[PDB]
Design a protein around this ligand. Sequence first.
Ligand SMILES: [Cl-]
Ligand SMILES: [Cl-]
Length: 308
Amino acid sequence: KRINIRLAHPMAPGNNVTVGYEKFKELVAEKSNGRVRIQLFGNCMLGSDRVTMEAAQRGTLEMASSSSPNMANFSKQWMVFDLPYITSPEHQQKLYKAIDDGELGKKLDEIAASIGLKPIMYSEYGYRNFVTTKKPIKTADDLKNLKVRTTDSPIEVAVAAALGMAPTPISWGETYTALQQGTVDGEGNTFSLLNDAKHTEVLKYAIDSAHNYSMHLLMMNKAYYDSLPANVQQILTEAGREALTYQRSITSELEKKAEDAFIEQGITVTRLSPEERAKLVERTRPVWDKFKDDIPAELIKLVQETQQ
Ligand SMILES: [Cl-]
Ligand SMILES: [Cl-]
């Protein structure tokens, strides 16, 4: 009568999200005295982010994790979290609280249910920063005319355009070559993903722009969740909440470690002045009006309430 629950996700061994799911597995095993077992299938072993979330939504997999921008393959409401400067690291504990215990978390539960899903962990996945191979970036104006790799996220593209940059959507697999060969001048990502992907080798400058925020959303198929005994639901819910407390902290530690690696490898990491941050915020705010008709005002308001 052991319950085997399969959990797929895209992330590499030792990544902050992976470690969170290892913690989740451990806690589910402890709380259930081994009666419930999470079977981990990381590093895209069951497919890409979209493939495994499709499977979780349809019920051929019990659980999957998708980045918040990729949750756009499934619903549009999640776009709220991609808006430039809707959140900043200073207010992160309040954001977490609101997701964990507040109206925001309840709304997100409702949205997930509408697409066949039950949230279990809102894994931290960090704030992206601009980096370059050769052109020094220390100011907002330094970003003008920079050729910058993007994902296929429309908000990412619009942000770059708003800052006067020249966005080029390139697949992840083509990105290192593009940086190395000079078909783009830079990119925007977390230091840990860049260091872990060894893009560090080809970079020379970084700014703490923090111009995008994202999470990695661990979801369970809702019909499957609703089929479980209450005690097993509770074990999963609690394991998720507890693992997330560790995962958010581990993320901070790994991001520090990645920034130190940048500095060790000779990358100049500029701490933006107040004046320059404010330019980034104001230049990117028109993006919110561009996408206004696609993101519910109520959701924007719940996220903004966490930042006051
Ligand atoms: Cl049990
Ligand atoms: Cl892409």
